[PDB]
Amino acid sequence: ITLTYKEGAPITIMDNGNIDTELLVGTLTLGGYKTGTTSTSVNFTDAAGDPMYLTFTSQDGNNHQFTTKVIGKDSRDFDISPKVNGENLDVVLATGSQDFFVRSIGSKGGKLAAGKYTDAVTVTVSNQ
């Protein structure tokens, strides 16, 4: 199993200190799964462990955070929803590898400060 990431475009902080929804934060590329592996067998987890969301954090020590969701697309451009911290919110993945987009939801609270945000992610693939 291989898991890489490609950061998307910069995220513009709105005047109210929040960010917009559905923005493409980055792309997770999963590969090496057996033939027929489906979405429910994929589970992305991070430290925050918030069911259905990957939480990103500031590196300034103030712990500014925003949540995102993970959604992929099948051949008909329909949503592919893998488990994130054990929950969704079932489709067969593409042969070989599959891209999962990290879509923005919004600040976890308070105004966000500009800078670099990260989230140490782990993916567990079952029924392999």
Added chain:
Amino acid sequence: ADLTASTTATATLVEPARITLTYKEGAPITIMDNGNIDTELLVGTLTLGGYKTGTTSTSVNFTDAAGDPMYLTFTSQDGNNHQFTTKVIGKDSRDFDISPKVNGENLVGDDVVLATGSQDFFVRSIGSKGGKLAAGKYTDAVTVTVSNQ
């Protein structure tokens, strides 16, 4: 069986440089019985906004073609070149008089941090070195330059 892999997701958030200005005209100016426009009249009210908290008063500079340091000059449109000067001033937290640069120089007060969110400034009439102001339309094209931190 369960197979795993891990990686680091990253994101870069940015704060744009937003600047807005709102100008609310004051009451019309009436010429006195001796030919002078009054002084300290509220010609208009400027509300500068958008800037990030920390923006300073010395980083704002209102300029015009006349380029008179500390003053904004209004000229008649009748071709006779009648003029009167005005100043741009405001208040800080402790209600002390403050002022942004006007053609490169501050007229009053020390440099300060602008009010959070937005800052109001008032264009106040001074008078005119020439005097004898004729009725008519007076104008000025003013540029407001903000040098963000």
Added chain:
Amino acid sequence: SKEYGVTIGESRIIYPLDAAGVMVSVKNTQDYPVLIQSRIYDENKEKPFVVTPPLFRLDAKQQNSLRIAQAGGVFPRDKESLKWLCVKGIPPDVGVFVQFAINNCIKLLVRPNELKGTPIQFAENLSWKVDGGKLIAENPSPFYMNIGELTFGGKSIPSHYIPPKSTWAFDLARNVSWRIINDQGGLDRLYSKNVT
């Protein structure tokens, strides 16, 4: 009343010395079309880098992008150099009529690839002292330390950048508390030290 507004996609531009160019967005936040006039000035605001287009129309609520390109030239490689990018939005009894135009300027920081790290890694390195009746900041790093918040003895001091390997003197306790603005324009963490 009248309304004016000009937004630049970022509050500063980190320009990698010798890079081909960088893009930056400009948005006309108003209900009327305007002419966007972009100018580049030296560290002292006086007429190197080319902005394309130098002048173009931007319809209401619309956004577009400028390309800032380094046109040859030479810069020191032991420290950043500072320029300013100004984006001006040009709108279409004593009677008084005054017209305004917003000239939004941000720092264009030329950064040699030879420099390692970013401002945030050295923000704490500033030292302070009082002399000549002024608070003096000393920046030993090769980066412009763009203070976004400064406090001395509990009283706020209006910010200003501290040039690389140099100093800056502020007009006027022993405790100094400051926060620099990071490359993305965010207020970085707080630091404190007593004047020497």
